[PDB]
Symmetry: C2
Subunit: 485 residues, 2 copies
C-alpha cells in the first residue's frame, strides 16, 4: 500500500504547519469577508436563490446549529455551508482568481463560516473557548491559496470539468483543520475529495446553460464539509488517488482534452506548480467593485469614461478609435457583428468601450436589448474601433509580480486630431489600486447591508468589520449572531 501522493501531502503540511505572517493578507482577507457577506445578503432578494435555502425538513431542530446570514435558519454545518456558499456566489459579484483555471475562492467561505460557527457554539457550551474570527480569516487565506495556486497552471475546463472541484478540495482541507484533524485524517479527507465525482460544466455553456452555474460552488464547499466530517469520524484514505494507473484521477480524468478527445503528452498528465503554498492568492485577489463588466474590459471602460469629456461634444465627428489591449482580451472578449442577447454585450470589448465613451458610464442597464437597438450610435462607434495587442500588456498579464489586465483607448477625429491615449493597466479591483478601491468595496458593503438590515444593525455590523483587531478578537458565534434575520 503506497503512501499518499505528494500533492495531497504538500496541501496537508501547508494547512497544518504554515504560519501566516503577512498582515496584508489578513487585511484583504477581512475586506474579502465583508465583500462576500454583502454579496450573499443581496442574493436573498432572488427567489431562484432562496428556494434552495433552509432545512431539508421544516421544523428541524439542530442544537448549536450554524446560522445563514440574513436569515433565521439554524442548520447542521453541511447544509448551512451549502446555503452560505449558494448565496455568496449567486449573483456573480464575489471575488475572482484568473489563471489557467478561473474561479471564485471566496466561495469557500461557506464551509469555513458554517463549521466555525457550529464549533464555537459547541465548545462554548462545554466550557471551552470559541474560535475567533481571526481563525476564519486564516482559513480563507489558506482556502484561497490552495484553490488559486493549483489553478495557476492546471485547467479543468480543458478536460471538461467544472472549476468547482478546487472549491471541494480547498474546503475539505480547511474545514478538516477547523474540526481539528491530525495529519492522517487530513490526508484521508483530501483523498476522498479527489476520488469523489467531479461535476461537468455543461450548465455553464449554451445551449444548456442554467442556474446550476450559480450553486455548483455552494454544493462543492458543502461536500467539503461532509468529506471532512467523514475523515473525522475515522474513515481510511486512498493513498494513490491521483497517481494510480488505470484507476487514478490522472489517467481517468486529467489525460484527455475535451475539445478533441486527444491524449495529453505524458509530461502534461500531472498537476504542475510554479510556486509553493503561501498567502499569494489572497494578497492578489480581484474584487468586483467598479463597472459591471468582464474583467478584461474593465480598464478599457475606465479609460473610456475618463475620455468622455473629450468626446461628449460631437460624437459624430469621431473617425478612429484604437483600443490597445492584452491578448486574452482579444481571445475571449473581442467580438465583431450583431449583439443579440445581453450575454453578447457582456462579452464584447467594443460594446463595453463604446457605451462609456458615449454616456460616461457603464451600468448593468446598458446591456438590455431595448437599450442597444435604441442607440445606433453604439454600433457606429463600434465599427470605428481597431484593436491592437500590445506585447508589454500581454506579457505582464502573465508576470506573477504584476498580473495586469491592461487596456488603452485613444479616439481620433475626422480633422486628424485625437484626444491622446488614456492607458489603464490595473482595474479598480486589483492589488495595485487597493487604496483607491477599498473605499468603493466598503460603500458597496454598506449598500448590500442596507438591503437586509435596519440602519442601527447596519452601523453595528460595519463598525465591527472596519476594526481589524476587534474583528479578529471576536468569537465566531458572536459575529454570526450579528448577522441573523
Amino acid at each position: 500500500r503506497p503512501d499518499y501522493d505528494a500533492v495531497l501531502q504538500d496541501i496537508a503540511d501547508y494547512v497544518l504547519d504554515y504560519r501566516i505572517d503577512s498582515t496584508e493578507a489578513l487585511d484583504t482577507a477581512r475586506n474579502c469577508l465583508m465583500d462576500t457577506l454583502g454579496c450573499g445578503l443581496l442574493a436573498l432578494r432572488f427567489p431562484e436563490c432562496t428556494k434552495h435555502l433552509g432545512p431539508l425538513v421544516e421544523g428541524t431542530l439542530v442544537p448549536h446549529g450554524a446560522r445563514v446570514p440574513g436569515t433565521s435558519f439554524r442548520l447542521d454545518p453541511v447544509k448551512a455551508a451549502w446555503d452560505i456558499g449558494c448565496i455568496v456566489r449567486w449573483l456573480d459579484y464575489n471575488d475572482t482568481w484568473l489563471a489557467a483555471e478561473w474561479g471564485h475562492p471566496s466561495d469557500n467561505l461557506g464551509g469555513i463560516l458554517a463549521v466555525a460557527d457550529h464549533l464555537s457554539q459547541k465548545r462554548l457550551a462545554n466550557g471551552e473557548a470559541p474560535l475567533s474570527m481571526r481563525q476564519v480569516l486564516e482559513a480563507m487565506i489558506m482556502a484561497h491559496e490552495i484553490q488559486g495556486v493549483i489553478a495557476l497552471e492546471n485547467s479543468f475546463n480543458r478536460v471538461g470539468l467544472d472549476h468547482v472541484l478546487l472549491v471541494k478540495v480547498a474546503s475539505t482541507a480547511v474545514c478538516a483543520k477547523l474540526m481539528g484533524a491530525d495529519r492522517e485524517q487530513l490526508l484521508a479527507a483530501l483523498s476522498h475529495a479527489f476520488v469523489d465525482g467531479q461535476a461537468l460544466r455543461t450548465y455553464r455553456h449554451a445551449p444548456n446553460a442554467g442556474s446550476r452555474k450559480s450553486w455548483a460552488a455552494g454544493d462543492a464547499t458543502s461536500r467539503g464539509v461532509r468529506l471532512a466530517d467523514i475523515a473525522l469520524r475515522g474513515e481510511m484514505g486512498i493513498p494513490g488517488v491521483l497517481s494510480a494507473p488505470q484507476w487514478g484521477f490522472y489517467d481517468v480524468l486529467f489525460s484527455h482534452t475535451s475539445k478533441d478527445l486527444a491524449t495529453k503528452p505524458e509530461d502534461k498528465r500531472r498537476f504542475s506548480f510554479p510556486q509553493g503554498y503561501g498567502s499569494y492568492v489572497m494578497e492578489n485577489v480581484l474584487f468586483k467593485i467598479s463597472f459591471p463588466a468582464e474583467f478584461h474590459a474593465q480598464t478599457a471602460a475606465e479609460a473610456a469614461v475618463r475620455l468622455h469629456p473629450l468626446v461628449k461634444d460631437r460624437l459624430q465627428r469621431i473617425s478612429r478609435i484604437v483600443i490597445t489591449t492584452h491578448e486574452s482580451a482579444i481571445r475571449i472578449i473581442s467580438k465583431v457583428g450583431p449583439l443579440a442577447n445581453p450575454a453578447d454585450r457582456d462579452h464584447c470589448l467594443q460594446y463595453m468601450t463604446a457605451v462609456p465613451l458615449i454616456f460616461g458610464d457603464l451600468v448593468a442597464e446598458h446591456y438590455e436589448d431595448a437599450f442597444h437597438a435604441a442607440h445606433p450610435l453604439i454600433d457606429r462607434l463600434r465599427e470605428k474601433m481597431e484593436i491592437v495587442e500590445e506585447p508589454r500588456y500581454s506579457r505582464e498579464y502573465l508576470e506573477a509580480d504584476k498580473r495586469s489586465i491592461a487596456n488603452a483607448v485613444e479616439v481620433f477625429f475626422d480633422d486628424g486630431s485625437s484626444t491622446g491615449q488614456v492607458a489603464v493597466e490595473y482595474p479598480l479591483g486589483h492589488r495595485r489600486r487597493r487604496a483607491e478601491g477599498i473605499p468603493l468595496l466598503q460603500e458597496k458593503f454598506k449598500a448590500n447591508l442596507a438591503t437586509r438590515f435596519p440602519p442601527q444593525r447596519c452601523q453595528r455590523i460595519f463598525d465591527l468589520c472596519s476594526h481589524q483587531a476587534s474583528l479578529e478578537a471576536t468569537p465566531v458565534n458572536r459575529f454570526m449572531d450579528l448577522l441573523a434575520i
Copy 2:
C-alpha cells in the same frame, strides 16, 4: 435550447407511465426487500460501518423523520438514505446484477425507503393517506430496471468510473417519482444526476482498495434523494447533458478506455440498449444465499461439496483437479500462489474450490489465516488445480435467456481413476432455482433478524413480510415502526 437527450426521456416516460402488474417481479421484490434489510441489520455489528450512521449534529430533532432499520435514529431523508444504503451494502451480502457492468440494484432501497417513510409521516400529519409498501416494491422494481438495463451493454469500469453512478441515476428517478414529480421535474432531476460528478473506482482496486467500497452506494442513493428534492423545488434542467459536444457526458467521460487512454470508435461513444425498460432485472436478479463466496465460484463451491463424500478420505491420492469454468471467473478470481489476507482467499476460485472439497462446506471462518495454516492440504490441492475455460459456459454467461455462472469440477487420483465431472451451471440464488433458493433466502432473513431483534418482534417482521397482499397494503410508516431499535 434543445429537448432532453433521448436516454433521459426514455427513462422518465418509463418511470411515470409504465404500470407494474408482473406477479413474479412483485414476489421477488418482496424477497429482495427481506434479504436486503436482513443484510443491513447484520452490518450493525460492525463499528467501521456504524461509525458513519446517525445525524451530523448529535441531538438533532427531525419532525416526521425517516427511520434507519435496527437503530433508534430519526433523520432527514437524505442522511437516512445514506445510512440505509450504507448498511445494506456494507458486508457485500445483498443481491447482484452481473452484466457489462456489475452492481447491486438493492442499494437503491436506501433512497426508496427513506423518502417513502418521511413522506408517509408528513402526509399523515396533514391528513393525507400515507404511502403503501406496494409503492416501495414498485419503486424497487423500477430502480432495479433502470440500473440493470443500462448495465446490460454499457461498462463504466472500462472508462474508469465506479458503477455507483447508476445507483444515483436510478435513485434520483424513483425518488423524484415518489416525491410526486411531473415529467419536466423528472427530466431535470435525471439531467442533474448525469451532469453530477461520478466517483472513480480507485477504492475497489489494490493497492488502494478500502472501506469506501462498502459505502459508495449509500453515498450515491443519498445523493439521488438530494437531487430529486432539488428538482421538486423547481430547479431547471440540463437538456443535452449527455450529447453536448465538448461539455457533455459522452465526450468527457464515456469517450475513453482507461487501460490505454485510447479513444473509442465513434459509434460506441454513447449508451447502447438490447431492450427497453420493463420488469426484467428484478425477475432475473441474483441473491447470495448459499456459501459466502464470490459469485463466479458459488457453483464451483457447490460442485465441490457434492464431490466431498467421494474424496473425503482419499485426499493424498488426488493428483489432478480439473475445474472447467467460464471466462469471467478465470479473469477475476483465478489466483495461483500465496494469499495474504481473507480478501485474497475470498476472491480465489482455487481456495473456494479446495476448502469445500476437503471439509464439505464453506463459511466465513475458512477465510481465516489461522484456518489456512492449520491445514496445508488446501495449498497441496490448490497447486493441483488446472483451470480450463469452457467456451459454452462463457457464452451462456452472456446470453440473456440463460445468464449461466457455470463451474464443472473433476477430481483425479494417482492410480489413474477419477470421480465424474460434477457440473453446476446455475447458483442457488439464480432465477432457475428460485424454488430451492427461497427457503434458504427466508432462513437467511430469519437469522439476520435474530442478530438485532428479540424473538417476538422477529416473528412479527417475518410474518408480515411473508404475506404478499398484507405487506403490500401496509403503510410505509408502520412497516418502519416495526424495524426501530
